[PDB]
Amino acid sequence: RFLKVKNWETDVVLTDTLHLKSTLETGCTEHICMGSIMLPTKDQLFPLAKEFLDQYYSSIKRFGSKAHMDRLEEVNKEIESTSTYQLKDTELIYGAKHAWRNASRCVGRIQWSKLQVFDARDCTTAHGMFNYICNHVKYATNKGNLRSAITIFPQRTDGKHDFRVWNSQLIRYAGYKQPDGSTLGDPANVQFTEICIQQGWKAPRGRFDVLPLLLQANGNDPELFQIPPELVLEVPIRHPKFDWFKDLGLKWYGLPAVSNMLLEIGGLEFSACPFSGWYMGTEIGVRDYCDNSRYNILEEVAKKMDLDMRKTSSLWKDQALVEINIAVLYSFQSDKVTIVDHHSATESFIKHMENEYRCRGGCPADWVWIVPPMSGSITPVFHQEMLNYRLTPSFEYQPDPWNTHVW
Amino acid sequence: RFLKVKNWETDVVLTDTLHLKSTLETGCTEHICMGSIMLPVRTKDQLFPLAKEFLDQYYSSIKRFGSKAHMDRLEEVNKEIESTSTYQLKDTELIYGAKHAWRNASRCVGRIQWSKLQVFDARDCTTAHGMFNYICNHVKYATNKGNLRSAITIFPQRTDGKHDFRVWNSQLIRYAGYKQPDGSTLGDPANVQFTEICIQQGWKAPRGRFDVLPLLLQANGNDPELFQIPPELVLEVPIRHPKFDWFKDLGLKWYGLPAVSNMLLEIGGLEFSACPFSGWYMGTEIGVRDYCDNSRYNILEEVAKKMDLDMRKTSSLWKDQALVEINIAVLYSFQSDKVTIVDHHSATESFIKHMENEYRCRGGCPADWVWIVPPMSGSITPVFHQEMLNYRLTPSFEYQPDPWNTHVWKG
Numbered sequence: 001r002f003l004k005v006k007n008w009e010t011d012v013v014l015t016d017t018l019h020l021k022s023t024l025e026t027g028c029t030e031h032i033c034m035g036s037i038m039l040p041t042k043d044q045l046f047p048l049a050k051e052f053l054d055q056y057y058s059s060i061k062r063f064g065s066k067a068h069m070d071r072l073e074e075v076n077k078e079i080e081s082t083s084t085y086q087l088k089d090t091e092l093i094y095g096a097k098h099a100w101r102n103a104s105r106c107v108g109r110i111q112w113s114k115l116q117v118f119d120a121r122d123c124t125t126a127h128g129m130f131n132y133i134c135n136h137v138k139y140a141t142n143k144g145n146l147r148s149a150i151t152i153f154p155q156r157t158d159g160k161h162d163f164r165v166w167n168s169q170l171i172r173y174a175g176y177k178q179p180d181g182s183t184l185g186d187p188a189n190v191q192f193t194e195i196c197i198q199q200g201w202k203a204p205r206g207r208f209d210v211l212p213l214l215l216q217a218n219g220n221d222p223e224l225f226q227i228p229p230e231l232v233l234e235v236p237i238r239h240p241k242f243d244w245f246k247d248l249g250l251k252w253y254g255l256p257a258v259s260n261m262l263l264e265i266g267g268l269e270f271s272a273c274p275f276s277g278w279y280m281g282t283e284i285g286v287r288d289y290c291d292n293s294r295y296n297i298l299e300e301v302a303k304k305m306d307l308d309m310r311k312t313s314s315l316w317k318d319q320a321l322v323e324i325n326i327a328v329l330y331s332f333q334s335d336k337v338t339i340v341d342h343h344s345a346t347e348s349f350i351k352h353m354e355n356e357y358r359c360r361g362g363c364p365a366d367w368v369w370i371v372p373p374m375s376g377s378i379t380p381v382f383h384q385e386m387l388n389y390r391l392t393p394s395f396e397y398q399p400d401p402w403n404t405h406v407w
Numbered sequence: 408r409f410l411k412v413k414n415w416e417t418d419v420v421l422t423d424t425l426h427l428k429s430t431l432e433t434g435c436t437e438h439i440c441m442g443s444i445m446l447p448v449r450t451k452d453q454l455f456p457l458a459k460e461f462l463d464q465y466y467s468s469i470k471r472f473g474s475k476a477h478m479d480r481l482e483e484v485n486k487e488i489e490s491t492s493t494y495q496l497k498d499t500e501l502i503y504g505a506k507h508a509w510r511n512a513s514r515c516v517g518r519i520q521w522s523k524l525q526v527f528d529a530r531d532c533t534t535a536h537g538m539f540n541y542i543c544n545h546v547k548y549a550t551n552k553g554n555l556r557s558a559i560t561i562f563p564q565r566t567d568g569k570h571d572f573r574v575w576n577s578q579l580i581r582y583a584g585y586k587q588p589d590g591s592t593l594g595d596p597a598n599v600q601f602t603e604i605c606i607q608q609g610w611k612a613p614r615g616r617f618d619v620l621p622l623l624l625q626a627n628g629n630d631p632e633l634f635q636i637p638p639e640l641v642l643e644v645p646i647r648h649p650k651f652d653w654f655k656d657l658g659l660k661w662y663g664l665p666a667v668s669n670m671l672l673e674i675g676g677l678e679f680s681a682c683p684f685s686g687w688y689m690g691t692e693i694g695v696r697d698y699c700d701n702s703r704y705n706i707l708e709e710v711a712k713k714m715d716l717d718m719r720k721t722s723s724l725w726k727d728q729a730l731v732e733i734n735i736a737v738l739y740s741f742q743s744d745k746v747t748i749v750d751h752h753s754a755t756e757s758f759i760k761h762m763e764n765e766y767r768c769r770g771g772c773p774a775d776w777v778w779i780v781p782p783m784s785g786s787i788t789p790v791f792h793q794e795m796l797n798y799r800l801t802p803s804f805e806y807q808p809d810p811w812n813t814h815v816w817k818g
């Protein structure tokens with residue numbers, strides 16, 4: 001019941017009790033661990049609403065109070081009458097911040113309580129969504145001094161009027177399959193890019209074409225919108241020592257903004273809830289740039305460094321990896337765009353974890369995701385045992401819209 | 408039931424059915440994943456089914472399932488268990504068993520080599536001196552002047568739990584660690600407690616930074632005894648860098664033989680508490696962990712200084728740069744001295760081929776992602792992108808409590 005996690009580097013042992021409040025399943029059983037798998041009614045709703053309202057009133061030190069009870073009855077009556085309910089602004093803010101607090105795969109949660117929440121529940125059209133999103137982007141970007149934020153569109157009603165941002169991230173580069181059989185741009189976005197073209201987008205067919213937004217409002221067919229170019233802050237990537245690096249013609253956008261997840265608060269489902277923070281270097285330098293199925297630039301960089309790529313044991317891939325990541329951090333820092341290196345970020349997470357264990361009884365964490373994709377054991381989280389469980393409010397994955405939308 | 412695992416780099420999807428044969432628990436539940444947790448005498452009653460399952464697996468493996476030989480063996484073991492409360496494995500079963508414990512070791516990235524294990528049957532061993540001799544022979548055979556050969560030496564199984572054979576060392580070869588009164592540590596910090604035990608037992612510690620520890624061996628439940636492995640049998644590699652001539656002056660070296668000696672080998676319900684096994688190193692074990700863990704030799708700073716990296720801010724990735732150089736050095740040195748070693752790219756690439764082969768020929772390959780992914784350059788190795796399923800199959804290697812915490816001293 002009372003589990004303990006140990007840090008094998010510091011010997012520090014923490015006891016987790018928060019997991020006992022876990023509701024959702026993990027995908028694992030006593031016979032099989034699926035820890036490395038990427039994707040493992042009025043009657044149903046009131047229980048969820050109650051659990052949420054209880055934690056909310058408990059957070060504001062008014063558990064059991066009349067206000068707590070009144071609200072509880074108010075929501076119950078509303079659910080029975082309207083088959084759903086509306087969160088108070090205070091509840092929405094608390095819920096969004098906690099969905100982030102509960103995101104087991106997020107290493108930057110020490111920042112959880114500073115989330116700027118934009119209530120977009122009054123939005124009704126795709127154009128309105130576009131406006132709200134540009135404001136989010138401009139607000140979060142803040143001329144390079146990034147600020148965490150989330151914009152929350154109307155909650156699901158009957159399932160045929162869902163609001164959705166079809167894009168996976170607000171800002172991402174297009175991908176196109178060339179005759180050469182090769183891929184131009186971001187291979188990860190080929191399918192999406194074609195859906196945009198299929199919709200009308202005039203693809204420039206460049207290596208870094210900022211994709212247009214495909215916004216779906218009230219269950220209607222999505223619409224294209226181009227984020228004002230001047231609102232999409234990008235960073236040209238250069239190395240502090242290798243002058244030839246700039247010649248690679250590499251650049252990345254400064255705002256990481258996830259837009260395909262579902263925010264669940266008190267049983268309510270917010271299918272369109274784009275949120276953003278700021279990058280941890282490795283996300284771009286290791287994953288976006290070096291993943292074989294992404295920009296896959298290791299060989300190109302290796303060649304320019306004049307490394308013995310004859311034998312894997314010379315560790316040329318590793319050396320080029322470090323350089324690509326040193327450049328990313330350097331380029332973002334030079335342009336005054338917020339970014340955190342994996343050492344600083346993981347150190348912060350350990351501190352956050354410690355706080356969470358002592359003030360909340362635990363911190364769900366997915367080791368597989370928390371440990372940076374490079375230099376794993378030289379970051380502290382590598383040596384930190386973690387317990388992964390699911391708490392609500394939460395951010396959940398949801399089916400891509402183009403595989404469920406009835407045009 | 409069928410479970411699928413996907414490689415997010417190649418889109419290749421594999422299907423696992425082998426997990427159905429999994430009996431042991433994982434530590435996880437439908438509500439909590441303990442995937443990153445390091446460590447989440449039987450009765451006649453519970454033993455025969457364990458013996459039967461194993462023998463069924465053994466006889467199927469040799470295509471004699473249901474044969475008269477198979478049935479006679481089950482009857483023989485049955486009679487043996489009821490009569491003696493235990494039973495003895497035939498040599499063939501022991502070999503098959505040891506090879507499978509390795510094959511089933513979900514935390515081992517080197518399993519493509521599982522079928523080539525040399526098994527030394529030391530079940531006739533009766534004293535610590537006897538154990539010493541067996542271990543020396545294992546070390547010499549495995550080392551093979553640098554052309555390392557995987558091997559395992561298996562001492563008598565557990566009987567009543569009061570006569571256990573145990574190798575107290577965690578690995579046959581490791582360097583002493585000494586806690587200085589000023590709080591600092593000389594040698595390998597990981598072995599301070601053990602080194603202290605050895606000293607208490609009479610070991611004359613040379614107190615250097617790389618002193619090969621003595622073997623502390625327990626035979627038949629008796630108090631352990633110290634033995635020094637003949638130095639000429641301990642192959643070591645001075646670590647130098649191909650381009651940095653100052654690296655050698657760091658005074659670093661490492662032994663060539665990785666030999667785990669504290670695990671328990673379970674075969675058909677029998678428990679072999681002393682089963683030292685060895686293979687060859689994957690560079691990162693030494694270069695990343697042994698050398699760069701903050702709680703081990705911790706050499707990142709000294710190395711970073713020499714390279715004169717910008718150590719004022721973490722964002723210069725000086726630790727990451729120094730890390731790669733150190734690992735290049737380990738691989739270079741071992742290769743230059745002709746001591747077998749494998750780099751993490753080659754090793755993980757082979758593991759993926761092994762895993763795919765296993766899914767197809769065996770219906771699965773239990774693997775612990777947390778352990779399989781190398782401690783450096785994670786995502787540039789193919790295993791990072793491979794979904795895996797972790798479950799426990801027997802025969803298997805299991806952790807067991809450290810002997811000094813459970814041993815009843817006789818004096």
Ligand code: HEM
Nearest residue numbers: 100103105106107108111148149275276277278279280395
């Ligand atoms: C302030 C800076 C932040 C940093 C440094 C940070 C860092 C990270 C990193 C490194 C990942 C893994 C990403 C990947 O490998 O794809 C991640 C995942 C995640 N983060 Fe954060 N994060 C931050 C802000 C946010 C915000 C503001 C939220 C929500 C309001 C959030 C929610 C999540 C979620 C749900 C995931 C997992 C997403 C998935 O499964 O694909 N993060 N974060």
Ligand code: HEM
Nearest residue numbers: 509512514515516517520557558684685686687688689804
């Ligand atoms: C032939 C070369 C071999 C290589 C390259 C290899 C490599 C590895 C590596 C890198 C690990 C993780 C080590 C760590 O981080 O502590 C590991 C663990 C393991 N290996 Fe292998 N291995 C090999 C041979 C063997 C042999 C011969 C056996 C048994 C017969 C074996 C059994 C295991 C077990 C049981 C584990 C997990 C040990 C633990 O939990 O501490 N390996 N191996």
Ligand SMILES: Nc1cccc(C[C@H]2CNC[C@H]2NCCCO)n1
Nearest residue numbers: 256257258275276277278279280283
């Ligand atoms: N720094 C942050 C903040 C919030 C979310 C993320 C993660 C985003 C940005 N990079 C990969 C993408 N996640 C994709 C997960 C695999 O599909 N990163």
Ligand SMILES: Nc1cccc(C[C@H]2CNC[C@H]2NCCCO)n1
Nearest residue numbers: 665666667684685686687688689692
């Ligand atoms: N190459 C091999 C072969 C078999 C076993 C191992 C693993 C050994 C050698 N390095 C760390 C140690 N395992 C310790 C696990 C953490 O306490 N490594």
Ligand SMILES: C[C@H](O)[C@H](O)[C@H]1CNc2nc(N)[nH]c(=O)c2N1
Nearest residue numbers: 036037038368369791792793794
């Ligand atoms: C198969 C495996 O789960 C997959 O490659 C995971 C591993 N860890 C990860 N960790 C983070 N932060 N992000 C990812 O996309 C992944 N991918």
Ligand SMILES: C[C@H](O)[C@H](O)[C@H]1CNc2nc(N)[nH]c(=O)c2N1
Nearest residue numbers: 382383384385443444445777778
């Ligand atoms: C806490 C965490 O489980 C621990 O640090 C693990 C992570 N992965 C590992 N992987 C390998 N190969 N070896 C280890 O010792 C570890 N330690």
Ligand SMILES: [Zn+2]
Nearest residue numbers: 028033435440
């Ligand atoms: Zn699990």
